[PDB]
Symmetry: C4
DNA sequence: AAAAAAAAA
DNA sequence: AAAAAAAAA
DNA sequence: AAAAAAAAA
DNA sequence: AAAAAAAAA
């Protein structure tokens, strides 16, 4: 069944969590198997309430596709990226909620800021969580994401015995 | 049985697909096992017909060997490579069909063009599919190909328990 | 059960050993599984007594977290790092024992010195083991640690079949 | 049982083959397991007789340890290394046979020469096989060796389920 | 014997 | 449908 | 709760 | 046929 092993970073103003969501397959009637819904690396941001305590109730999610992951793992020290998502895309509720994830180098080069911005035009809200990530932490993510990439793409099914 | 989990890139004029084809083994009569036919990373190109629709019927294939894969994964941002294949090599139908795959940096350095050219002297045809690949996409391929390399070489059979 | 396969470096004044300690999980009552205690890469230092012989009785341990590992694997040739640990942290016996691990480039750039310093204010002792590590050896550690990182984080549980 | 999946390079004057030899373990009476004899990446060189044919009878072997592998995978384009081995080391027949493997950059930077030199003072012979390796081929070896490194060290036994 | 804790299904 | 072959247990 | 879709065995 | 040894559960 499920497995819950997130890599988490807890900082002053918010927490950040990351974990793979594996792809789903379908057993063709030809006998073989076929990849159905794509894996992602799910990012969870949540707010620090009171003192070193965190409000899981107010979390926001951002799903990194294979291609966004490749974008993060191939980032230089001075590079930055920005991803834009609509959860209710190609559906009835589109344009209402808008998420943007930005990864920017801090001035020192000592790391990066990762922030999730959520604008909800239905509930008339505007949230923003930012978490600083050291060079070491981002190194864990780079290495963990690279490990995970083949798996969310379903390439770990190509094995000899 | 089979597993179908291609990494695909869909662009203006054509689509590109990539997936490992595992090596085949033979159970020696000595008891052990021996690698028989070599794995490849198969590339499939196909043409965009009408509007964001793609003509799977007109696809062309290109099989990357272990060594060609090593050539792609070790490419710098400014490097380019070109591979030349005859499907009916060392057989009766050689010289008739000629395939060439070129990976070139786009001017921006924002990625690469991958194109397959097929010249068929039997059917008197000349096809060319080109697909632009961003830095992020080519990063997925590099990471996915590196993951896959040991597997198509059959080295995933060397495992402790 | 247990598995004992340390990578070891034996030098003039001391020995150094490194091996992963896997994370522990808990089978939720929801059916799924949940990561409980975190994996580390355990480092063991011990003193050379007499001539090319080593006093296992006087060993000192240092547990690298996921994040410390990411710090070591992402070190340039000229970089150095220093980690500080209190084994009896957040408990009753804190402040008494203090461990610090330093990884510094040797002058040549031919490698690094890895040293563990242990100050025990209970037993009134002060130990220091230093082991030089060549570029090749540190390359084994970098590659072995990167391989191990996903595993100590419990990400090897996310697998397709 | 055995598995035979060598990566091979066939050139003008000789052939080169490479494959992992896994470590051996012992089931402790404590229940757990303990690594016994170390894995290597075995290199096999053999001479080209006549025209594109190769004399397997005259092969010479060279066993790369974990540390030698780390030395090869961390080589820059312009780096070179040289390893020296006595097969009958610490035994009665030492000093008699002497093997040396050299990896040097070719002038172009288009690759490397890998050569095995064997001097046998018992049989009064002196053999030398040299095989040029392109950047692509050496990229396969680097990637395949890095994949294999954890395995020959027995670290693939540290797995979650 | 090991630096811990912070959300949660 | 795929570029092959070269040593061998 | 998650940005989707495009070929196909 | 292979470069070995050094601590230990």
């Amino acid at each position: 069944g499920r497995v819950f092993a997130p890599y988490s970073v807890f900082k002053g103003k918010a927490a950040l969590s990351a974990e793979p969501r594996l792809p789903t397959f379908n057993r063709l009637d030809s006998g073989g198997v076929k990849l159905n819904r794509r894996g992602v690396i799910m990012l969870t941001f949540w707010p620090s309430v009171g003192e070193r305590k965190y409000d899981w109730e107010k979390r926001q999610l951002f799903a990194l596709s294979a291609t966004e992951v490749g974008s993060l793992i191939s980032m230089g020290t001075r590079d930055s990226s920005e991803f834009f998502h609509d959860p209710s895309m190609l559906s009835s509720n589109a344009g209402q909620v808008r998420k943007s994830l930005s990864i920017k180098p801090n001035a020192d080069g000592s790391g990066y800021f990762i922030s999730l911005s959520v604008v909800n035009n239905n509930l008339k809200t505007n949230d923003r969580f930012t978490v600083p990530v050291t060079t070491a932490e981002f190194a864990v993510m780079r290495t963990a994401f690279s490990f995970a990439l083949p798996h969310i793409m379903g390439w770990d099914r190509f094995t000899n015995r």
